[PDB]
Amino acid sequence: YKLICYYTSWSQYREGDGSCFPDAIDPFLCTHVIYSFANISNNEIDTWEWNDVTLYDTLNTLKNRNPKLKTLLSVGGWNFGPERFSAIASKTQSRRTFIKSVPPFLRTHGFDGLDLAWLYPGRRDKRHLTTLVKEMKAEFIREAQAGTEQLLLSAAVSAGKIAIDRGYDIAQISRHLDFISLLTYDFHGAWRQTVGHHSPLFAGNEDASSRFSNADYAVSYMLRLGAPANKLVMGIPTFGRSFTLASSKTDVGAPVSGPGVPGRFTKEKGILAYYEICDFLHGATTHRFRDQQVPYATKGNQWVAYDDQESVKNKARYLKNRQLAGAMVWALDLDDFRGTFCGQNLTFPLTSAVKDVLAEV
Ligand SMILES: *[C@@H]1O[C@H](CO)[C@@H](O[C@H]2O[C@H](CO)[C@@H](O[C@@H]3O[C@H](CO)[C@@H](O)[C@H](O)[C@@H]3O)[C@H](O)[C@H]2NC(C)=O)[C@H](O)[C@H]1NC(C)=O
């Protein structure tokens, strides 16, 4: 079983303990570690942060302690403009440019593959996205003729029914990608004035219309569409989403007024790291959607939807039972990586739990 773990570049700048660098990563924790977001310049892959080539080095040294550990570089991301991605893949000329540029870049900095994080192809991009994948892989196959281990190619894919249908030819790209990461944690929030859980595993028979907004559907649909289980990787949250309540109500459907107040370390309205939540939990009221199988907490006028050890194990067994290829954890740097926020003296508690379940039968 695979355990893909993303690490984000900008997490280095959080203050105090919040600060996280590649060397804080347990080299045996995950099987695949993904350095988050490389940039594109003049149609060539390139660095982003001022010290990337240094962090690259840091991250890839872990490979000296664990020879089996594989690393990848993800392109795109949220601060990368989809349009941008669009422009590059639309023209065979700029596309080939970008592609030819990749292999050397990765060989140079020591990465074992490329992760495409084109954040949401449009109805008009579906045909190009497929192209970009074919040719990219075709190139990776050609570069392997030089006696080195073939480069890996993967992609983070939305788990949103409409999004999927609108921009992905899942049956095609699945044959060319080594694995696909399902962003199964973006089901709510997305600015809709009512409290709700972003990563529910299940259907929850109550108040519906969505029905498609849970990991289960997502997984099932993907399967239906043609993507093999042995290439699917389910996404697992290591952060929670917060909301500022507009009334004293707390149950399902509760009126919301906007995102939650920022955390002392991540400082971004609407998000919390698990380690911030661990601190938030002191003096709060914890609840759990039985049908969906995920927590949520409240304190004052703040409402939080998050994933805990159990929920995570839950989802992990789930993916095992459907026989998928593995789990994907968004934000090793959002987990309690110091192991000094969530109590039970343990480093990477959430990520660790997934591993434990995956190591089980
Ligand atoms: C990720 O790569 C991007 C593409 O190379 C790069 O984007 C930018 O490229 C230049 C370099 O700064 C920008 O320059 C400006 O825009 C106008 C002219 O177009 C000037 O008048 C102005 O003075 C300024 O120099 C481009 O605007 C911008 N281009 C695009 C298409 O985004 C990014 O800098 C890079 N991001 C990071 C974080 O490194």
UniProtKB/Swiss-Prot annotation:
It is found in: Secreted, Extracellular space; Cytoplasm; Cytoplasm, Perinuclear region; Endoplasmic reticulum. Glycans are attached at N39, N345. GO terms for biological process: activation of NF-kappaB-inducing kinase activity; apoptotic process; carbohydrate metabolic process; cellular response to tumor necrosis factor; chitin catabolic process; inflammatory response; lung development; positive regulation of angiogenesis. GO terms for cellular component: cytoplasm; endoplasmic reticulum; extracellular space; perinuclear region of cytoplasm. Detected in mammary gland. Disulfide bonds join C5-C30, C278-C342. Pfam families: Glyco_hydro_18. The keyword Lipoprotein does not apply. SUPFAM superfamilies: (Trans)glycosidases, Chitinase insertion domain. Keywords: Antimicrobial, Apoptosis, Cytoplasm, Disulfide bond, Endoplasmic reticulum, Glycoprotein, Inflammatory response, Lectin, Secreted. Coiled coil: none annotated. Belongs to the glycosyl hydrolase 18 family. InterPro entries: Chitinase_II/V-like_cat, Chitinase_insertion_sf, Glyco_hydro18_cat, Glycoside_hydrolase_SF, Glycosyl_Hydrlase_18. PANTHER family: CHITINASE (PTHR11177), CHITINASE-3-LIKE PROTEIN 1 (PTHR11177:SF202). PROSITE patterns: GH18_2. The keyword Metal-binding does not apply. Residues 1-360 form the GH18 domain. This is Chitinase-3-like protein 1. Carbohydrate-binding lectin with a preference for chitin. Has no chitinase activity. May play a role in tissue remodeling and in the capacity of cells to respond to and cope with changes in their environment. Plays a role in T-helper cell type 2 (Th2) inflammatory response and IL-13-induced inflammation, regulating allergen sensitization, inflammatory cell apoptosis, dendritic cell accumulation and M2 macrophage differentiation. Facilitates invasion of pathogenic enteric bacteria into colonic mucosa and lymphoid organs. Transmembrane segments: none annotated. Residues 302-316 are annotated as: Important for AKT1 activation and IL8 production. Its main location: secreted. Chitin binds at E49, W50, G76, G77, W78, N79, Y120, L183, T184, Y185, D186, R241, W330. Monomer. One of its GO terms (molecular function) is chitin binding.
